[PDB]
């Protein structure tokens, strides 16, 4: 009668099988840190979720980079920490060093291990094919673990992927939106930003999964070898699906739409209209052409499809043709 329900294709069950104390952030209790113990050095970024600074920890003098936690409701924090701490360790992911509070005003701010601060964004139409694919497959080893660590990132954009290019080291970052996997839970549907919002972000379909950070990395993908920022650039919500409409076209969205019962509102229909696929050959231009291979635009097609069960799992993904020879000559780093 409702919307169908879904599950995630692969690593459906790891909270379940993992114990109690993992995935239920809430019943965490948040060890806290001396802030005393680090002192700012300089300013990085600033917005509208944190202030970012450079800072040094003066019980040991090493480099450390502390964010400043926006007024966020408690349980949202401790799910942050407690995802990070999970997920501490594992490959690209940003390492979480210590937790403190303000000793006046309580703010709680995060300090990380030092990365240098120079995101994707800033980078990603400067570096050659190969580079664009050894980043890519970067990304997916922080993705593949995650997930397999029963974590959404729901984030991903290359805003939240910082590059130290000399030394060729990634890290994704940004996990404040990020949400353990339980099958059959339904999510909120206000995450990510517009432009790599998922197909059922934009059509309100909450049972979604891992698969949804797969949609957010093709759109990065697609804005890179097709040098076109943002590739899908919606000028509101609505807007946002009708972008990706006129590149996959009309037909599989319904199709999608059909396959969980979604309900759409009556307006949204008219507003989409009929529009056909567009090959992806038709985004490719002489300025650009050097990024763009056959591979490419197969694992492209295999990452932006609306059905969220058909997506390539970051796996699959690694093990495409794509990063042939990148995993070939990684196999001697
Ligand atoms: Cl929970
Ligand atoms: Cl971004
Ligand atoms: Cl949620
Ligand atoms: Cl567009
Ligand atoms: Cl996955």
């Given at each position: 009668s409702g919307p169908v329900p879904s599950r995630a294709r692969v690593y459906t069950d790891v909270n379940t099988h993992r114990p109690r104390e993992y995935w239920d952030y809430e019943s965490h209790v948040v060890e806290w840190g001396n802030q005393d113990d680090y002192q700012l050095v300089r300013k990085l970024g600033r917005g509208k979720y944190s202030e970012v600074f450079e800072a040094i920890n003066i019980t040991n003098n090493e480099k450390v980079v502390v964010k400043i936690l926006k007024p966020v409701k408690k349980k949202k924090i401790k799910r942050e920490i407690k995802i990070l701490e999970n997920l501490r360790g594992g490959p690209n992911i940003i390492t979480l060093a210590d937790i403190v509070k303000d000793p006046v005003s309580r703010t709680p701010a995060l300090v990380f291990?030092?990365?240098?601060?120079?995101?994707?964004?800033?980078?990603?139409?400067?570096?050659?094919?190969?580079?664009?694919?050894?980043?890519?497959?970067?990304?997916?080893?922080?993705?593949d673990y995650c997930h397999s660590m029963g974590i959404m990132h729901?984030?991903?954009?290359?805003?939240?992927?910082?590059?130290?290019?000399?030394?060729?080291?990634?890290?994704?970052?940004d996990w404040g939106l990020a949400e353990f996997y339980h099958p059959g839970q339904e999510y909120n549907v206000r995450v990510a930003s517009r432009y790599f919002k998922g197909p059922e972000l934009l059509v309100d379909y909450q049972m979604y999964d891992y698969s949804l950070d797969m949609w957010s990395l093709g759109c990065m993908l697609a804005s890179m070898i097709f040098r076109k920022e943002p590739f899908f650039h919606g000028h509101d919500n609505y807007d946002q699906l009708v972008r990706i409409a006129k590149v996959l076209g009309t037909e599989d969205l319904y199709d999608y739409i059909d396959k969980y019962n979604i309900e759409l509102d009556p307006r949204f229909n008219d507003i989409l209209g009929r529009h056909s696929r567009k090959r992806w050959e038709r985004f490719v231009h002489s300025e650009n052409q050097?990024?763009?291979?056959?591979?490419?635009?197969?694992?492209?097609?295999?990452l932006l499809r609306y059905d969220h069960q058909s997506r390539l799992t970051a796996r699959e993904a690694m093990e495409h043709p794509y990063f042939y020879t990148v995993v070939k000559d990684q196999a001697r780093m």
């Open positions: 291990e030092h990365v240098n601060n120079t995101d994707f964004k800033q980078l990603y139409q400067t570096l050659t094919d190969y580079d664009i694919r050894f980043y890519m497959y970067e990304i997916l080893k922080a993705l729901r984030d991903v954009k290359p805003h939240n992927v910082m590059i130290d290019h000399e030394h060729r080291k990634l890290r994704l970052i050097h990024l763009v291979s056959p591979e490419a635009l197969d694992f492209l097609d295999k």
